[PDB]
Structure formats: structure tokens, C-alpha cells
Design a protein around this ligand. Structure first.
Ligand SMILES: Nc1ncnc2c1ncn2[C@@H]1O[C@H](COP(=O)(O)OP(=O)(O)CP(=O)(O)O)[C@@H](O)[C@H]1O
Ligand SMILES: Nc1ncnc2c1ncn2[C@@H]1O[C@H](COP(=O)(O)OP(=O)(O)CP(=O)(O)O)[C@@H](O)[C@H]1O
Ligand SMILES: [Mg+2]
Ligand SMILES: [Mg+2]
Lengths: 280, 280
């Protein structure tokens, strides 16, 4: 059970000297969904860019399938086929073409025939509800529409690992729920997911494991439920628990539960508890 | 007349023909905080770009202080000084220079002294905890840091009206709380706020009024608590009440809230009410 991806002791400063990763290590079990959380500037984006080989560290290394990645053209090509990335700014990921052309580029560049590439593209467009935008120039789109196009282009590649940098920023509710359904489906099909987010509710909905970043290091890592219900540890990266868990931890302290009972984590669970409560 | 801004019957299609605003009317009372919500592509950004005179409609008009604006160079300059806009994409708003210089340009272009400009810059940077980035090149920043710099540049100009296009996208929790504090202070000083967002919790925390956009038109507008608790109307733009408000409504359903008090509209407010609950 070697992880599919492992960051080992990554240290990276940008040209110009700004330090971004400081001895960062993080292992990603195959088939898991890993949420990465932490403050602006903690190094989440830079870490994702190391995991698909966009950036190379000054020290440390990334392992893919248990082996050090290698830095050749064939190496990097194989690496990027296996590990896809949806950038934080979707506009940076788009080409000056129509939506269909944009999403087609990847599968075609994979040396796929016209037919298998076509099927990939059509399914990706449908999965993100942008089929009707196929002939739209990518610049003639709203921010949330652009986000869908960028995600569709990545998913059309069917990578072994999908990295997403703040995938739901700017998405409307319908789009967020549709993306959740898609990502759950891809995971069920065996895909590994790593996503940065400031949405702790998204982490709660999608992650098996959670890593908290601060100042270029992993401050804490564990199963999603254990980390997301830990008020003191989350506070060290200036986060609160997901709202229902937040309140429900408060309820447990206040003596509203049992005691002996499990913590309500859903709206439904909390609603059921409320019927046994009154005002003082 | 009385509202500080009024969109009257705005119709706009982009070059190339994509329709964006469809006979849209929206009035903004001076001093209010207005949230604009609605699906990706609904026309939220396009409307904001009409309100500060960036885009000119094919039909309809914008009134500023009850007066039709006009489109001369000097009309536009005066309009933009009175109505600032934080763009949806921070990179579109940042100059290729240091953070301090970027934020200083607005005040300096207003004809203020270097001493006044300096004070405005330092106040804006400190409000969003980025004083220590003053000499950082704006490209050498994370997405959330860039968001803070763009907001700082707009608030340093101290406009009559501040428009914010999805200002918390990519922002961490601390940044969001600091933005709320900043915006509350600016409004107390008399500033009018209009913000587009997909974060309905932000709307709950910050808005006096909420407008719901659908396919280029205002579907509904009203007092924030009324709109954000209106399950039926929210469903028409594929929204639900914010989780805090859902839980507050749920609490009221079980009589756990103030006979007649306004709903808790923030996590802290909901948590406070919890202190007064006991088991049956
Ligand atoms: N530069 C551009 N050229 C052409 N059409 C554009 C455009 N920018 C946006 N559009 C189109 O104009 C309409 C309104 O887009 P707008 O960006 O105002 O929506 P919005 O701000 O509500 C969406 P989002 O929440 O996704 O940011 C949509 O149909 C969109 O595809
Ligand atoms: N292109 C660039 N050049 C130089 N420094 C950069 C940079 N992009 C980011 N940085 C810096 O690198 C560090 C890590 O930033 P990174 O963008 O990886 O973090 P992050 O993704 O956790 C933040 P966010 O939540 O704001 O998107 C910060 O100190 C940031 O200012
Ligand atoms: Mg980032
Ligand atoms: Mg927009």
C-alpha cells in the first residue's frame, strides 16, 4: 500500500526569494480524497504545483507510484498524464478557442483517435453542464462558466490523480453540488483526489483525509472526521469546524447531548436533537 | 432621485452578441449594503460594470444621485471616483509593481499629497493584515493575498459607493472576518456597498438588502432577512437559505428562539442562543 503520490521534504522558494514550502511532506493513498486547508499564503497552491511537476523543489522530491519522478520530457509527459491539475484561476487554464476546442486539446494531445477523444469531450461537457456552450469562445464566458470549462478539460483526460486548487470558488450552488456528484463518481471509479479549499463544508462533504497547512509546512494530518471535529487544532490555522459539527460540539459541552450520544454532523441529525431541547 | 444609484431598464449584449442584461432595473438607497445573488451567468458582473460606467448599455441608463450620468471623459472620471469596483479577477486590477505603489496610485491620482496617500495606503493594508507585504511585487503573492491588495486599492480611494464582485473568493476565514469588519466600518462612515457573491453566509452577515438575479433580470429584491429565509423564492435561482439561517429557522420551528427576535444570521449569533438551551 504505497501511496500513489508522496511529497518528501519539499523546500521551495520562488525566484526572487519568497519561501513557499518548508520541508513539506505529505503522502496520498491511492483512491483517497485529500482536502488541504490553511491560511492564504500557507503554500497550498505551490504544493499542488509540485505534485504535478509544474515546479521543482530546491530540495526534497515527489514520488509517483513509489518511485522518484524523474525530470525528462517523457517523464514529465507521463507524470502530467497521470496527475491533472485544475488551476486556481480558471482563466489561466483556457485557450483562445471555443469551449469544445479547448476541452478537446488534452485528449487529442494524448494521441487519441478522433473518436475516443470525441467521446471524452462530449462526456466531460455533459458532466459539467456546459454542452450548450460548446461553440462559445472561451473569453465569452462568466467566471463560473470558465471554471466549469477548466474542470471539464482536466476530467476529459481521465487522470489517475486529479488535483484541484480551490475548485468551488466562484461556483454557484447548483454547480457546486454537480461537481460534488462528479468527484464522488470519479473517486468511485478509482480516481485519487487532492483539493485545496477554504470551504470546510466542502472538505466535510468530500474528504477522507484532511491536511492543515501553515507557513509552508503540514501542521496536522488525519482522517477527515477526526480533524474537522477538533476545534483546538483547527484554531491553529484560524478555522472553525463545519457549522453543524461546530454547534454540536457546543451542545456536547453545554450538556445538551445525552450524555453518551454520538455527535450530530448533519442538519437532519441536529434537527432531531432540537425536539428534545427547550429554552431556559 | 433619492437612491444613490439606479439602473433603469438596462439592456446589454456583449460584442459578438451574447445577451447579458435584459431590461434590468435596480435601485440602491444611499448607505445600504446590497447583496446580489444568482446563478453563474445571470449578469451580476455585467450589472456591476454598468454601475461604475465601464460598460454602456444599448438601451436604458444609470442614474447617479438621481442624475443621468453622461459619458464624457470628465463625466466618467467623476463617476469612477464616486463609484469604485473590486473586479472579480484580482489580476485584472493589480499593477505590476509593489503592493504599496499599487495601492498608492488611486490616492495620488485624486491629487492627494504623498502624506495623505501614505496614510490611506497604510490604513488599507493594515485593515486586511498585509502591511508586511508593502514592498512585495504584486506578482509575488498568493491568490488570497492578491484579493486583499485589490480590495485595499479600492478602499484607499474612499468612494461614495463601493462595488465588490465576489470579494471573498479565495479568501481565508481570517481575511473574510477582517473584510467584514472593514466594510462595516466604511458603511458606518456613510459608504454604500453593493456586492455580488455565491457565499450566501456573507450576504447574511453583511447585507441590509438582497437582490436575486436570473437571466439578466432582477427576479426579487427585499430586506435581507426576508429574502434569505424565503425558501420558495430562493429556489427560483437554485438557492437555499444560508446554513446559519436554515438552522435558525429550524431552531424557531422548535421554539428555541426569542419570541419575535430577528433570526441569528451569523455563526456567533446562533452559538450565543445555544447558551440558553436546556434538555427536557
Ligand atoms: N466578455 C464576455 N463576452 C461575451 N459574453 C460574456 C462575457 N462575459 C460574460 N459573458 C456572458 O454574459 C452573461 C452574463 O455574464 P456575467 O459574467 O455578468 O454573469 P455573472 O457575474 O452573474 C456570472 P458568475 O457568477 O459565473 O461570475 C453570460 O451569458 C456570460 O456567458
Ligand atoms: N508567483 C509567485 N512568486 C513569488 N511568491 C509567490 C508566488 N505565488 C505565491 N507566492 C508566495 O508563496 C507563498 C505560498 O503561496 P501559495 O499561493 O502557494 O499559498 P496558498 O495557496 O496556500 C494561498 P491562497 O489560500 O491565498 O490561495 C506565499 O508566501 C506567497 O506570497
Ligand atoms: Mg492559492
Ligand atoms: Mg462574473
Amino acid at each position: 500500500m504505497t501511496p500513489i503520490l508522496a511529497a518528501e521534504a519539499l523546500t521551495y522558494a520562488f525566484p526572487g526569494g519568497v519561501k513557499a514550502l518548508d520541508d513539506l511532506s505529505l503522502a496520498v493513498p491511492k483512491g483517497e480524497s485529500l482536502a488541504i486547508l490553511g491560511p492564504n499564503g500557507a503554500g497550498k497552491s505551490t504544493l499542488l504545483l509540485h505534485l504535478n511537476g509544474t515546479l521543482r523543489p530546491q530540495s526534497g522530491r515527489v514520488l509517483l507510484g513509489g518511485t522518484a519522478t524523474g525530470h525528462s520530457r517523457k517523464d514529465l509527459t507521463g507524470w502530467r498524464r497521470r496527475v491533472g491539475l485544475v488551476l486556481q484561476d480558471a482563466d489561466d487554464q483556457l485557450f483562445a478557442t471555443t469551449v469544445f476546442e479547448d476541452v478537446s486539446f488534452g485528449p487529442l494531445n494524448l494521441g487519441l483517435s478522433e473518436a475516443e477523444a470525441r467521446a471524452r469531450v462530449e462526456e466531460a461537457l455533459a458532466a459539467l453542464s456546459i454542452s450548450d456552450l460548446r461553440d462559445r469562445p472561451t473569453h465569452m464566458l462568466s467566471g463560473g462558466q470558465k471554471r466549469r470549462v477548466a474542470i471539464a478539460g482536466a476530467v476529459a483526460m481521465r487522470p489517475e490523480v486529479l488535483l484541484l486548487d480551490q475548485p468551488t470558488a466562484g461556483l454557484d450552488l447548483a454547480g457546486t453540488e454537480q461537481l460534488l456528484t462528479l468527484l464522488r463518481g470519479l473517486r468511485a471509479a478509482g480516481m485519487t483526489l487532492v483539493f485545496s479549499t477554504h470551504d470546510v463544508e466542502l472538505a466535510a462533504a468530500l474528504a477522507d483525509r484532511v491536511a492543515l497547512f501553515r507557513t509552508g509546512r503540514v501542521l496536522a494530518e488525519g482522517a477527515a472526521e477526526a480533524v474537522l471535529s477538533d476545534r483546538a487544532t483547527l484554531a491553529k490555522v484560524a478555522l472553525r469546524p463545519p457549522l453543524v459539527i461546530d454547534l454540536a460540539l457546543l451542545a456536547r459541552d453545554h450538556g445538551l447531548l445525552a450524555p453518551e450520544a454520538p455527535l450530530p454532523k448533519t442538519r437532519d441529525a441536529l434537527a432531531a436533537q432540537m425536539a428534545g431541547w427547550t429554552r431556559r
